[PDB]
Amino acid sequence: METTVFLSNRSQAVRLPKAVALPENVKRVEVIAVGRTRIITPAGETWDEWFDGHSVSADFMDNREQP
């Protein structure tokens, strides 16, 4: 028989030094692409970052104005 030689599949990673490393409880992580940035959250806590920050002005959608 006759087969082929190939290289294993790689992927683009980011490194986290110990000063910004994630705790030991998180072995799975959710990643979200917001524009040019990306957000690294624990598996079942994907919305905590958007809830604790990201405030809108007080006038936003005070009137839906649906005809």
Binding site: W50, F51, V56, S57, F60, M61, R64, Q66
Partner: protein, 132 residues
């Protein structure tokens, strides 16, 4: 894996006030939520007429980047036309944006997640949930 469609009222309710009970409902159902592009139209309109459009568009981007936005296609317009006729035979008034959102969910077999269920109550053939 798509299961829920969020209406416009629940999005305004969540973005303005950021409730704790909604945060746990979102974290558990992550990856199964979406909105119609009609709702995206209303959200973008609210930011563009506000006093801080760029800041408010940034908050919408983070919200949208975590869910899917469905296009209002021919099937969605078809169910919306039927619902509008079904509602006309009664004395049930429903808003034009809410009519299109309801027909969009019915065309995809999705559950409407809303802020007050009594306005989607009169449409036949779709299920609603109250996440307030």
């Amino acid at each position: 894996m798509l299961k829920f469609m969020l209406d416009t009222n629940i999005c305004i309710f969540t973005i303005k006030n950021k409730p704790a009970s909604v945060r746990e409902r979102f974290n558990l159902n992550q990856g199964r939520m979406c909105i119609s592009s009609v709702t995206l139209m209303e959200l973008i309109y609210g930011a563009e007429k506000s006093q801080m459009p760029e800041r408010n568009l940034a908050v919408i981007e983070g919200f949208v980047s975590r869910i899917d936005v469905l296009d209002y296609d021919a099937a969605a317009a078809t169910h919306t036309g039927q619902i509008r006729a079904e509602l006309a035979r009664q004395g049930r008034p429903v808003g034009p944006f809410d009519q299109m959102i309801a027909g969009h969910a019915r065309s995809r077999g999705l559950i409407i997640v809303t802020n007050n269920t009594r306005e989607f109550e009169r449409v036949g053939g779709l299920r609603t949930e109250d996440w307030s």
